[PDB]
Amino acid sequence: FEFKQKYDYFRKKLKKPADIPNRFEMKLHRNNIFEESYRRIMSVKRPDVLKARLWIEFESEKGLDYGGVAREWFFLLSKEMFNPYYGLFEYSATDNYTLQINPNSGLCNEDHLSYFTFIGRVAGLAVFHGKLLDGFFIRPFYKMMLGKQITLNDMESVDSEYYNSLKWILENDPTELDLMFCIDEENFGQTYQVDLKPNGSEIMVTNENKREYIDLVIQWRFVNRVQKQMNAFLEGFTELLPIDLIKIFDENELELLMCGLGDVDVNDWRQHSIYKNGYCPNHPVIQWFWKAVLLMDAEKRIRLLQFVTGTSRVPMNGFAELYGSNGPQLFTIEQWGSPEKLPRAHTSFNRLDLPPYETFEDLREKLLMAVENAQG
Amino acid sequence: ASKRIHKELNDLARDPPAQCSAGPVGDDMFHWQATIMGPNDSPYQGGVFFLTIHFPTDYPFKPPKVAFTTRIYHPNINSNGSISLDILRSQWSPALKISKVLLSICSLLCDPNPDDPLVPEIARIYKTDREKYNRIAREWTQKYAM
Amino acid sequence: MQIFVKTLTGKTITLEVEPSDTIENVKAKIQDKEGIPPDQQRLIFAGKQLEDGRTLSDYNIQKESTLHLVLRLRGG
């Protein structure tokens, strides 16, 4: 209810100006969508015109819809903007698939700022027209839009083990860990040390500055090296919508508002899964598993994925490109235990130890349980 | 990160961890290698296993990656040598010293954890047919650990 | 004596116990109302991990004490 309530009130406050075309004229080649889309959207001088209906046609797929090519144009341009290899955004981790601004975006695309506002122009444009962008960001991103402050707490969704280690520094004496006010970076197999503050390389994390240290570490991890960018993204995002008209939503709501839910494509999933120690594609238990998945709804599915892989998200190129601690690792299902035991998982190898269940509902009950009553 | 590693290194030099030695090879200070001797009167008796210890640039906020290079027949250690130890993932703490992670691995060798296994087939054996597990595990020590 | 065992879903399992019962048994009972083997259970009581080698009166778990059913499920 609460979310539904809010959304609607949100939709209405928005207003279509009266001195703009009936629709927005767009026709471009699917194989060069980014640059072309970029030039079009980024030339309009009456940014308001962009509030007109999406009228799109590609000189490739001459599908006479021109309504539905709007749902696609977003799903297609996203795969471009939020591609970890274009250089504008990257993955928070090798196995997290949640995007974040590349601090070194400037040293990749030479005038990247114009591009961020563009991604912003679009980004918001999609919210105005009730569409969704593809891919998700680390909480801090959303929090930056909302005008929230970033803190130690915010890096637990991004990197738990790091969070905890920092939180330890916070509740103990760190003099023995012999830390210095600096970090370590890598590029071309070379590890180079960077200072958090002037001469940090030479300063110890005592028990008097341990707070100020956890500050710089977080400041640097999610804020220092991207404010110019994150700001451009907003310049554009708000050329379509009033930034404060959105503060009514929260971190998770705003997320669901522009990046929807992450409903997992069940097919691409089943197809890129491997079975070990007994199980195989046509095995009885396996046959049920998937029929159990078929039944679950968006939430329960994403959870199931989170319980087994440790991330509720999925790579850009699907389940074929899944990663584990040590690299590429397809979803795995291995036979283990007696029917008594609940199913287990090792988020490091994206594996699921599934005890050989005797009946379908027998499996469904123990699975749906592990999934829900989980993450602790 | 740097100072943290050296210091911890000399701390091994001064009073080392019994049954296990570990230090960097080559110049790199982020890539060590360790040796652990099969706990006495365990099926790994007589053997000597080799391990790699890669320290991430996020140390010690993130745990070091530790793996067995020498084939070993155990319930929580697979063919790649991936070790299913808790203080290596969910339980790591910036305070922990290598000596203590190495020693923890010795522990796991003489007294497995067959209920939170990494290798299912082996777990069931060490649970139902113990002397089997011992016979097998011992033979692997002859082929790969010697 | 009556207590509560809250699962991570918001649900709760009210059971019937006596102050001398060993935590190892609070699970045997939750194991019939939920069917969850004890070795995959963890009852967290106000930030502390209650042992199966103790009793309800050792941690002052009294009438209406709300423990927590934590599923110990990710592997080793």
Coordinates of C-alpha atoms in Angstrom, one line a residue:
Chain A
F1 CA 0.0 0.0 0.0
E2 CA 2.4 2.7 1.2
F3 CA 4.5 2.5 -1.9
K4 CA 1.6 2.3 -4.2
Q5 CA 0.0 5.3 -2.5
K6 CA 3.1 7.5 -2.8
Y7 CA 3.9 6.5 -6.4
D8 CA 0.5 7.7 -7.7
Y9 CA 0.6 11.1 -5.9
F10 CA 4.1 11.3 -7.5
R11 CA 2.9 10.7 -11.0
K12 CA 0.3 13.4 -10.8
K13 CA 2.3 16.3 -9.4
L14 CA 4.3 15.9 -12.7
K15 CA 3.0 18.1 -15.5
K16 CA 3.2 18.1 -19.3
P17 CA 3.9 21.6 -20.6
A18 CA 1.4 22.7 -23.3
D19 CA 3.8 24.2 -25.9
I20 CA 5.6 21.0 -26.9
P21 CA 5.0 18.6 -29.9
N22 CA 2.5 15.7 -29.8
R23 CA 5.5 13.3 -29.6
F24 CA 9.3 13.2 -29.6
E25 CA 10.8 12.2 -33.0
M26 CA 13.3 9.4 -32.8
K27 CA 14.6 7.0 -35.4
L28 CA 18.1 5.4 -35.1
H29 CA 20.1 2.3 -35.8
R30 CA 20.0 -0.3 -33.1
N31 CA 23.8 -1.0 -33.7
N32 CA 24.9 2.6 -32.8
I33 CA 22.2 3.5 -30.3
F34 CA 24.3 5.2 -27.6
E35 CA 26.1 7.8 -29.7
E36 CA 23.0 8.5 -31.8
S37 CA 20.7 8.7 -28.8
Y38 CA 23.3 10.9 -27.2
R39 CA 23.3 13.5 -30.1
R40 CA 19.5 13.7 -30.3
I41 CA 18.6 14.1 -26.6
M42 CA 21.6 16.4 -26.1
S43 CA 20.8 19.0 -28.8
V44 CA 17.3 19.9 -27.7
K45 CA 17.3 23.4 -26.4
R46 CA 13.8 23.3 -25.0
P47 CA 14.5 20.4 -22.6
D48 CA 10.7 20.4 -22.1
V49 CA 9.9 18.9 -25.6
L50 CA 11.4 15.7 -24.1
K51 CA 8.2 15.5 -22.0
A52 CA 6.3 14.6 -25.2
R53 CA 5.4 10.9 -26.0
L54 CA 8.2 8.6 -27.1
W55 CA 8.0 8.0 -30.9
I56 CA 10.8 5.7 -31.9
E57 CA 11.8 3.6 -35.1
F58 CA 15.0 1.9 -36.0
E59 CA 16.3 1.5 -39.6
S60 CA 16.8 -2.1 -38.8
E61 CA 13.7 -3.5 -37.1
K62 CA 10.8 -2.0 -39.0
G63 CA 8.2 -3.2 -36.5
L64 CA 5.2 -1.0 -36.8
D65 CA 4.6 -0.6 -33.1
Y66 CA 6.0 2.9 -32.3
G67 CA 4.6 2.6 -28.8
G68 CA 6.6 -0.4 -27.7
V69 CA 9.9 0.7 -29.2
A70 CA 9.9 3.0 -26.1
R71 CA 10.1 0.1 -23.6
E72 CA 13.0 -1.2 -25.8
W73 CA 14.9 2.0 -26.4
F74 CA 15.5 2.2 -22.7
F75 CA 16.4 -1.5 -22.2
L76 CA 18.7 -1.1 -25.2
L77 CA 20.4 2.2 -24.3
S78 CA 20.9 1.1 -20.7
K79 CA 23.0 -1.9 -21.7
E80 CA 25.2 0.8 -23.2
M81 CA 25.4 3.6 -20.6
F82 CA 25.7 1.2 -17.7
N83 CA 28.2 -1.0 -19.3
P84 CA 31.2 -1.6 -17.1
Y85 CA 33.4 -1.3 -20.1
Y86 CA 32.3 2.0 -21.7
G87 CA 34.1 3.6 -18.8
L88 CA 31.3 5.7 -17.4
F89 CA 30.2 3.2 -14.8
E90 CA 31.7 0.1 -13.3
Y91 CA 30.9 -2.8 -11.0
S92 CA 31.3 -2.3 -7.3
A93 CA 32.8 -5.8 -7.2
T94 CA 33.9 -8.5 -9.6
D95 CA 30.8 -10.5 -8.4
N96 CA 28.3 -7.9 -7.3
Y97 CA 27.0 -6.4 -10.6
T98 CA 25.7 -3.3 -9.0
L99 CA 27.0 -0.2 -10.8
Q100 CA 28.8 2.9 -9.5
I101 CA 30.5 5.9 -11.0
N102 CA 34.0 5.2 -12.2
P103 CA 36.2 7.8 -10.4
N104 CA 38.7 7.5 -13.4
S105 CA 35.9 8.1 -15.9
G106 CA 37.6 11.2 -17.1
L107 CA 40.8 9.4 -18.1
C108 CA 38.6 7.2 -20.4
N109 CA 36.1 9.4 -22.2
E110 CA 37.6 12.8 -22.7
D111 CA 34.6 15.1 -22.0
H112 CA 32.7 12.6 -19.9
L113 CA 30.7 15.3 -18.0
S114 CA 28.5 16.0 -21.0
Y115 CA 27.8 12.3 -21.1
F116 CA 26.8 12.0 -17.5
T117 CA 24.2 14.8 -17.8
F118 CA 23.1 12.9 -20.8
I119 CA 22.7 9.7 -18.8
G120 CA 20.9 11.9 -16.4
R121 CA 18.7 13.5 -19.1
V122 CA 17.6 9.9 -20.1
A123 CA 17.6 8.4 -16.5
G124 CA 15.0 10.9 -15.3
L125 CA 13.3 11.0 -18.7
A126 CA 12.5 7.4 -18.1
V127 CA 11.0 8.1 -14.6
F128 CA 8.8 10.9 -16.1
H129 CA 7.5 8.4 -18.7
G130 CA 7.1 5.5 -16.2
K131 CA 9.8 3.3 -17.8
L132 CA 12.7 1.5 -16.3
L133 CA 16.5 1.6 -16.6
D134 CA 18.5 -1.6 -16.8
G135 CA 21.0 -2.4 -14.0
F136 CA 21.3 -1.2 -10.4
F137 CA 23.6 1.0 -8.4
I138 CA 25.2 0.8 -4.9
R139 CA 22.9 2.4 -2.3
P140 CA 25.2 5.5 -2.0
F141 CA 24.2 6.5 -5.6
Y142 CA 20.5 6.7 -4.7
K143 CA 21.3 8.3 -1.4
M144 CA 23.3 11.0 -3.2
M145 CA 20.2 11.9 -5.3
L146 CA 18.0 12.0 -2.2
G147 CA 20.5 14.4 -0.7
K148 CA 21.3 12.0 2.1
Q149 CA 24.7 11.8 3.7
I150 CA 26.9 8.8 3.1
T151 CA 28.3 6.9 6.1
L152 CA 29.9 3.8 7.5
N153 CA 26.6 2.1 7.5
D154 CA 26.1 2.5 3.8
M155 CA 29.0 0.2 2.9
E156 CA 27.5 -3.0 4.1
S157 CA 25.4 -3.5 1.1
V158 CA 28.5 -2.9 -1.1
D159 CA 31.1 -4.9 0.9
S160 CA 30.2 -6.7 4.1
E161 CA 33.6 -8.0 5.1
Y162 CA 35.0 -4.5 4.6
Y163 CA 32.1 -3.0 6.6
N164 CA 32.7 -5.2 9.5
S165 CA 36.5 -4.7 9.5
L166 CA 35.9 -0.9 9.6
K167 CA 33.3 -1.2 12.2
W168 CA 35.9 -3.1 14.3
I169 CA 38.3 -0.3 13.9
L170 CA 35.4 1.8 15.2
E171 CA 34.7 -0.2 18.4
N172 CA 38.3 -1.2 19.4
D173 CA 41.8 0.2 19.7
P174 CA 43.6 0.0 16.3
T175 CA 47.2 0.8 17.4
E176 CA 48.3 -2.8 17.1
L177 CA 47.0 -3.2 13.5
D178 CA 49.6 -0.7 12.6
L179 CA 47.6 1.2 9.9
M180 CA 48.6 4.3 8.1
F181 CA 46.5 7.1 6.6
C182 CA 46.7 5.7 3.1
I183 CA 45.3 2.9 0.9
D184 CA 46.7 0.6 -1.9
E185 CA 45.8 0.7 -5.6
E186 CA 46.6 -1.6 -8.5
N187 CA 47.1 -1.1 -12.2
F188 CA 49.3 -3.1 -14.6
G189 CA 50.3 -5.5 -11.8
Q190 CA 51.8 -2.7 -9.8
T191 CA 50.6 -1.9 -6.3
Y192 CA 50.8 1.9 -5.6
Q193 CA 50.1 3.5 -2.2
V194 CA 47.8 6.6 -2.0
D195 CA 47.4 9.0 1.0
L196 CA 44.0 9.7 2.6
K197 CA 45.2 13.1 3.8
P198 CA 48.4 15.0 3.4
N199 CA 51.4 12.9 4.6
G200 CA 49.0 10.1 5.6
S201 CA 51.5 7.6 4.4
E202 CA 53.5 8.6 7.5
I203 CA 50.8 8.8 10.0
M204 CA 49.5 6.1 12.3
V205 CA 45.8 5.4 13.0
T206 CA 45.9 6.0 16.8
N207 CA 43.0 5.7 19.0
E208 CA 42.4 9.5 18.8
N209 CA 41.9 9.7 15.1
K210 CA 40.4 6.3 14.4
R211 CA 37.1 8.1 13.7
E212 CA 38.5 10.7 11.3
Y213 CA 40.2 7.7 9.5
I214 CA 37.0 5.7 9.0
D215 CA 35.8 9.0 7.6
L216 CA 38.4 9.5 4.9
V217 CA 38.2 5.8 3.9
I218 CA 34.4 6.1 3.3
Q219 CA 34.7 9.6 1.9
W220 CA 37.2 8.2 -0.7
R221 CA 35.5 5.0 -1.4
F222 CA 32.1 6.5 -2.5
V223 CA 32.4 10.3 -2.6
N224 CA 35.6 12.3 -3.3
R225 CA 36.4 10.9 -6.8
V226 CA 32.9 11.4 -8.3
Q227 CA 31.2 14.5 -7.2
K228 CA 31.8 16.3 -10.5
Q229 CA 30.2 13.4 -12.3
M230 CA 27.4 12.7 -9.9
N231 CA 26.6 16.4 -10.2
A232 CA 26.4 16.4 -13.9
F233 CA 24.1 13.3 -13.7
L234 CA 21.8 15.5 -11.6
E235 CA 22.0 18.6 -13.7
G236 CA 20.4 16.4 -16.4
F237 CA 18.1 14.3 -14.2
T238 CA 16.5 17.5 -13.0
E239 CA 16.1 19.0 -16.5
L240 CA 13.1 16.8 -16.6
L241 CA 12.1 16.5 -13.0
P242 CA 12.3 18.7 -9.8
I243 CA 14.9 17.0 -7.6
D244 CA 13.0 17.7 -4.4
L245 CA 9.7 16.3 -5.8
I246 CA 11.5 12.9 -5.4
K247 CA 12.9 13.2 -1.8
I248 CA 9.4 11.8 -0.9
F249 CA 10.7 8.3 -1.8
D250 CA 13.4 6.4 0.1
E251 CA 16.7 4.6 -0.9
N252 CA 14.8 1.4 -1.7
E253 CA 11.7 3.1 -3.1
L254 CA 13.7 5.4 -5.5
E255 CA 15.5 2.3 -6.6
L256 CA 12.3 0.4 -7.4
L257 CA 11.1 3.6 -9.0
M258 CA 13.7 3.8 -11.8
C259 CA 15.4 0.5 -11.8
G260 CA 12.3 -1.6 -11.0
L261 CA 12.6 -5.0 -9.3
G262 CA 15.2 -7.4 -10.5
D263 CA 13.0 -10.2 -11.7
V264 CA 15.4 -13.0 -12.6
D265 CA 14.9 -14.5 -16.1
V266 CA 14.2 -18.1 -15.1
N267 CA 15.1 -19.6 -18.4
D268 CA 18.5 -18.0 -19.0
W269 CA 19.0 -19.3 -15.4
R270 CA 18.0 -22.9 -15.8
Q271 CA 20.1 -23.1 -19.0
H272 CA 23.3 -21.9 -17.5
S273 CA 23.3 -24.0 -14.4
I274 CA 25.6 -27.0 -13.7
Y275 CA 24.9 -30.0 -11.6
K276 CA 27.3 -32.0 -9.4
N277 CA 27.6 -35.1 -7.3
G278 CA 24.6 -37.0 -8.7
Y279 CA 22.2 -34.4 -10.0
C280 CA 21.7 -33.7 -13.7
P281 CA 19.2 -31.8 -16.0
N282 CA 16.5 -34.4 -16.1
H283 CA 16.8 -35.7 -12.6
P284 CA 13.6 -35.8 -10.5
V285 CA 14.8 -33.5 -7.7
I286 CA 16.1 -31.1 -10.3
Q287 CA 12.9 -31.3 -12.3
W288 CA 11.1 -30.1 -9.3
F289 CA 13.5 -27.4 -8.2
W290 CA 12.7 -25.4 -11.4
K291 CA 9.0 -26.1 -11.2
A292 CA 9.3 -24.7 -7.7
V293 CA 11.1 -21.6 -9.1
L294 CA 8.4 -21.3 -11.7
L295 CA 6.0 -20.9 -9.0
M296 CA 7.9 -18.4 -6.9
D297 CA 7.2 -14.7 -7.6
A298 CA 9.7 -11.9 -8.4
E299 CA 10.7 -11.5 -4.7
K300 CA 11.2 -15.1 -3.7
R301 CA 13.2 -15.7 -6.9
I302 CA 15.6 -12.8 -6.3
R303 CA 16.0 -14.0 -2.7
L304 CA 16.7 -17.6 -3.8
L305 CA 19.4 -16.1 -6.1
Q306 CA 20.8 -14.0 -3.2
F307 CA 20.8 -16.9 -0.8
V308 CA 22.9 -19.0 -3.2
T309 CA 25.1 -16.4 -5.0
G310 CA 25.2 -13.7 -2.3
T311 CA 23.9 -11.0 -4.7
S312 CA 20.3 -10.3 -5.7
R313 CA 21.5 -9.0 -9.0
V314 CA 22.6 -10.5 -12.3
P315 CA 25.4 -9.6 -14.8
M316 CA 24.5 -7.6 -18.0
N317 CA 24.9 -10.7 -20.2
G318 CA 23.0 -13.0 -18.0
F319 CA 23.7 -16.1 -16.1
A320 CA 26.3 -17.2 -18.5
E321 CA 28.6 -14.4 -17.1
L322 CA 28.2 -15.2 -13.4
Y323 CA 31.1 -14.7 -11.1
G324 CA 32.4 -16.2 -7.8
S325 CA 35.2 -15.3 -5.5
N326 CA 37.8 -16.7 -7.9
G327 CA 36.2 -15.8 -11.1
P328 CA 33.6 -17.1 -13.6
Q329 CA 31.3 -19.5 -11.8
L330 CA 27.9 -20.6 -13.2
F331 CA 25.0 -21.2 -10.8
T332 CA 25.6 -24.7 -9.4
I333 CA 23.4 -27.3 -7.7
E334 CA 25.0 -30.1 -5.8
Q335 CA 23.4 -33.0 -4.0
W336 CA 24.0 -33.2 -0.3
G337 CA 22.5 -34.4 3.0
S338 CA 19.4 -36.2 4.1
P339 CA 15.8 -35.0 3.4
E340 CA 15.7 -33.7 7.0
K341 CA 18.2 -30.9 6.5
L342 CA 17.4 -27.5 4.9
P343 CA 19.3 -26.6 1.7
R344 CA 22.7 -25.0 2.1
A345 CA 24.7 -22.5 0.0
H346 CA 28.3 -21.3 -0.6
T347 CA 28.0 -17.7 -2.0
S348 CA 31.6 -18.1 -3.1
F349 CA 31.0 -20.8 -5.7
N350 CA 27.4 -19.8 -6.3
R351 CA 26.5 -23.3 -5.2
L352 CA 23.5 -24.9 -3.6
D353 CA 23.7 -28.1 -1.6
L354 CA 20.2 -29.6 -2.2
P355 CA 19.3 -32.7 -0.2
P356 CA 17.5 -35.3 -2.3
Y357 CA 13.9 -34.7 -1.5
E358 CA 11.2 -37.3 -1.8
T359 CA 8.3 -35.2 -2.9
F360 CA 7.7 -32.0 -4.8
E361 CA 6.0 -30.2 -1.9
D362 CA 8.5 -31.8 0.3
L363 CA 11.2 -29.8 -1.6
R364 CA 9.1 -26.7 -2.0
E365 CA 8.6 -26.4 1.8
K366 CA 12.2 -26.8 2.7
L367 CA 13.3 -24.5 -0.1
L368 CA 10.8 -21.7 0.4
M369 CA 11.8 -21.8 4.0
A370 CA 15.6 -21.5 3.6
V371 CA 14.9 -18.6 1.1
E372 CA 12.6 -16.6 3.4
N373 CA 14.0 -17.4 6.8
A374 CA 17.5 -16.5 5.5
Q375 CA 20.5 -14.2 5.3
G376 CA 21.7 -14.6 8.8
Chain B
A1 CA 49.0 -2.5 4.4
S2 CA 52.7 -2.5 3.6
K3 CA 53.9 -2.0 7.2
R4 CA 51.2 -4.3 8.4
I5 CA 52.7 -7.2 6.3
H6 CA 56.4 -6.8 7.1
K7 CA 55.8 -6.5 10.9
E8 CA 53.6 -9.6 10.7
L9 CA 56.3 -11.3 8.8
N10 CA 59.0 -10.7 11.4
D11 CA 56.5 -11.8 14.0
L12 CA 56.6 -15.2 12.3
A13 CA 60.4 -15.0 12.3
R14 CA 60.7 -14.5 16.0
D15 CA 58.3 -17.2 17.3
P16 CA 57.0 -19.1 14.3
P17 CA 53.9 -21.1 14.1
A18 CA 54.7 -24.8 14.8
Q19 CA 54.1 -27.3 12.0
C20 CA 53.9 -24.5 9.4
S21 CA 56.3 -22.0 7.8
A22 CA 55.1 -19.3 5.4
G23 CA 56.8 -16.3 3.8
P24 CA 57.0 -14.4 0.5
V25 CA 58.8 -15.9 -2.4
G26 CA 60.3 -13.6 -5.0
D27 CA 60.2 -9.9 -4.1
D28 CA 56.5 -9.4 -4.0
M29 CA 55.1 -8.8 -0.5
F30 CA 51.5 -9.6 -1.5
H31 CA 52.2 -13.2 -2.5
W32 CA 53.4 -15.6 0.1
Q33 CA 53.5 -19.4 0.1
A34 CA 53.1 -21.7 3.1
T35 CA 53.9 -25.3 4.1
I36 CA 51.9 -27.3 6.6
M37 CA 52.9 -30.8 7.8
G38 CA 50.2 -33.4 8.1
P39 CA 49.2 -33.5 11.8
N40 CA 50.8 -36.5 13.5
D41 CA 48.7 -39.6 13.6
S42 CA 46.1 -38.2 11.2
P43 CA 45.7 -39.8 7.9
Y44 CA 47.9 -37.0 6.5
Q45 CA 50.8 -38.4 8.6
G46 CA 54.2 -37.9 6.9
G47 CA 52.9 -35.6 4.2
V48 CA 53.8 -32.0 3.6
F49 CA 51.3 -29.7 1.9
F50 CA 52.0 -26.4 0.1
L51 CA 49.8 -23.3 0.2
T52 CA 49.5 -20.0 -1.5
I53 CA 48.7 -16.8 0.4
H54 CA 47.6 -13.9 -1.7
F55 CA 47.1 -10.7 0.3
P56 CA 44.6 -8.3 -1.4
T57 CA 45.4 -4.6 -1.7
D58 CA 42.4 -4.2 0.7
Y59 CA 44.2 -5.9 3.5
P60 CA 43.6 -6.1 6.3
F61 CA 40.0 -4.8 5.8
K62 CA 39.4 -7.9 3.6
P63 CA 40.8 -11.4 4.5
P64 CA 43.8 -12.8 2.7
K65 CA 43.0 -15.4 0.0
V66 CA 44.4 -18.8 1.2
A67 CA 44.6 -22.0 -0.9
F68 CA 46.1 -25.5 -1.0
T69 CA 48.2 -26.1 -4.0
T70 CA 49.0 -29.7 -3.0
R71 CA 46.2 -32.3 -3.7
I72 CA 44.6 -33.3 -0.4
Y73 CA 41.7 -35.6 0.4
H74 CA 39.6 -33.7 3.0
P75 CA 36.0 -32.8 3.5
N76 CA 36.4 -29.0 3.5
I77 CA 39.2 -28.7 0.9
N78 CA 38.4 -29.3 -2.8
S79 CA 40.6 -30.0 -5.8
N80 CA 41.5 -26.4 -6.4
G81 CA 42.5 -26.2 -2.8
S82 CA 39.7 -23.8 -1.8
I83 CA 39.5 -24.0 2.0
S84 CA 36.1 -23.8 3.7
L85 CA 37.2 -22.0 6.8
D86 CA 35.1 -19.4 8.6
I87 CA 37.8 -16.9 9.7
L88 CA 38.6 -16.6 6.0
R89 CA 35.3 -15.1 5.0
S90 CA 32.4 -14.2 7.4
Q91 CA 34.6 -14.4 10.5
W92 CA 37.7 -12.5 9.4
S93 CA 38.7 -9.5 11.6
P94 CA 41.5 -7.0 10.9
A95 CA 43.0 -8.1 14.2
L96 CA 43.7 -11.8 13.2
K97 CA 47.4 -12.7 12.5
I98 CA 48.6 -15.2 9.9
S99 CA 50.2 -17.5 12.5
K100 CA 46.6 -18.0 13.8
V101 CA 45.0 -18.7 10.3
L102 CA 47.8 -21.2 9.5
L103 CA 47.4 -22.9 12.9
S104 CA 43.6 -22.9 12.3
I105 CA 44.2 -24.9 9.1
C106 CA 46.2 -27.5 11.0
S107 CA 43.3 -27.9 13.3
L108 CA 41.0 -28.5 10.3
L109 CA 43.3 -31.2 9.1
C110 CA 43.3 -33.6 12.0
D111 CA 39.7 -32.8 13.0
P112 CA 37.5 -32.1 9.9
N113 CA 34.0 -30.5 10.0
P114 CA 31.9 -33.1 8.1
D115 CA 28.6 -31.3 8.7
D116 CA 29.5 -28.0 6.9
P117 CA 31.3 -29.7 4.0
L118 CA 32.8 -28.3 0.8
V119 CA 33.1 -31.8 -0.7
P120 CA 29.9 -33.8 -0.1
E121 CA 31.1 -37.2 -1.2
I122 CA 34.0 -37.1 1.2
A123 CA 31.9 -35.8 4.1
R124 CA 29.6 -38.8 3.9
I125 CA 32.5 -41.1 4.0
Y126 CA 34.3 -39.5 7.0
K127 CA 30.9 -39.9 8.7
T128 CA 29.7 -43.4 7.8
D129 CA 32.8 -45.3 6.8
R130 CA 35.6 -43.7 8.8
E131 CA 38.4 -46.3 8.2
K132 CA 37.6 -45.9 4.5
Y133 CA 38.2 -42.1 4.5
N134 CA 41.4 -42.8 6.4
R135 CA 42.6 -45.4 4.0
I136 CA 41.9 -43.1 1.0
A137 CA 43.1 -39.9 2.5
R138 CA 46.3 -41.7 3.6
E139 CA 46.9 -42.9 0.0
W140 CA 46.7 -39.4 -1.4
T141 CA 49.4 -38.3 1.0
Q142 CA 51.6 -41.0 -0.6
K143 CA 50.9 -39.7 -4.1
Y144 CA 50.7 -35.9 -3.8
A145 CA 52.0 -35.0 -0.4
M146 CA 55.4 -36.8 -0.5
Chain C
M1 CA 6.3 -21.0 31.3
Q2 CA 5.7 -19.5 27.8
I3 CA 8.2 -18.1 25.3
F4 CA 8.5 -16.8 21.7
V5 CA 10.9 -17.7 18.9
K6 CA 10.9 -15.1 16.1
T7 CA 12.0 -16.2 12.5
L8 CA 13.6 -13.8 10.1
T9 CA 10.3 -13.4 8.2
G10 CA 8.5 -11.7 11.1
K11 CA 6.7 -14.9 12.0
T12 CA 6.8 -16.4 15.6
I13 CA 6.7 -19.8 17.3
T14 CA 5.2 -19.8 20.8
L15 CA 6.4 -22.8 22.7
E16 CA 5.8 -24.4 26.1
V17 CA 8.9 -24.8 28.3
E18 CA 10.3 -25.0 31.9
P19 CA 13.3 -23.0 33.2
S20 CA 15.5 -26.0 33.4
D21 CA 15.3 -27.1 29.8
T22 CA 18.6 -27.2 27.8
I23 CA 18.7 -24.9 24.7
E24 CA 19.5 -28.1 22.8
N25 CA 15.9 -29.0 23.4
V26 CA 14.2 -25.7 22.6
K27 CA 15.3 -26.7 19.1
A28 CA 14.0 -30.3 19.2
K29 CA 10.5 -28.7 19.8
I30 CA 10.9 -25.9 17.2
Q31 CA 11.9 -29.0 15.1
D32 CA 8.3 -30.2 15.0
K33 CA 6.5 -26.9 14.6
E34 CA 8.9 -26.0 11.8
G35 CA 10.8 -29.2 11.0
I36 CA 14.3 -27.6 11.2
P37 CA 17.1 -29.9 12.4
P38 CA 19.0 -28.5 15.4
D39 CA 22.5 -28.4 13.8
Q40 CA 21.2 -25.8 11.4
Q41 CA 19.7 -23.7 14.1
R42 CA 20.9 -20.8 16.2
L43 CA 18.8 -19.0 18.9
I44 CA 20.1 -15.5 19.3
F45 CA 19.0 -13.8 22.6
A46 CA 19.6 -10.1 22.8
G47 CA 23.0 -10.1 20.9
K48 CA 24.2 -13.4 22.5
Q49 CA 24.5 -16.9 21.1
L50 CA 22.8 -19.2 23.6
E51 CA 24.5 -22.6 23.9
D52 CA 22.9 -26.0 23.7
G53 CA 24.8 -26.8 26.9
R54 CA 22.9 -24.4 29.0
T55 CA 19.3 -24.0 30.3
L56 CA 16.6 -21.3 30.0
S57 CA 17.3 -20.1 33.6
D58 CA 21.0 -19.7 32.8
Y59 CA 20.4 -16.7 30.5
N60 CA 17.4 -15.5 32.6
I61 CA 15.1 -16.5 29.7
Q62 CA 11.8 -16.1 31.5
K63 CA 8.0 -16.0 30.8
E64 CA 7.6 -14.3 27.4
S65 CA 11.3 -14.0 26.5
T66 CA 11.7 -13.5 22.7
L67 CA 14.7 -15.4 21.3
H68 CA 15.5 -15.6 17.6
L69 CA 15.6 -18.4 15.1
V70 CA 18.7 -17.8 12.9
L71 CA 19.1 -20.4 10.2
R72 CA 22.8 -21.4 10.0
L73 CA 22.7 -22.3 6.3
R74 CA 25.5 -20.9 4.2
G75 CA 28.2 -23.5 3.9
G76 CA 31.7 -24.2 5.0

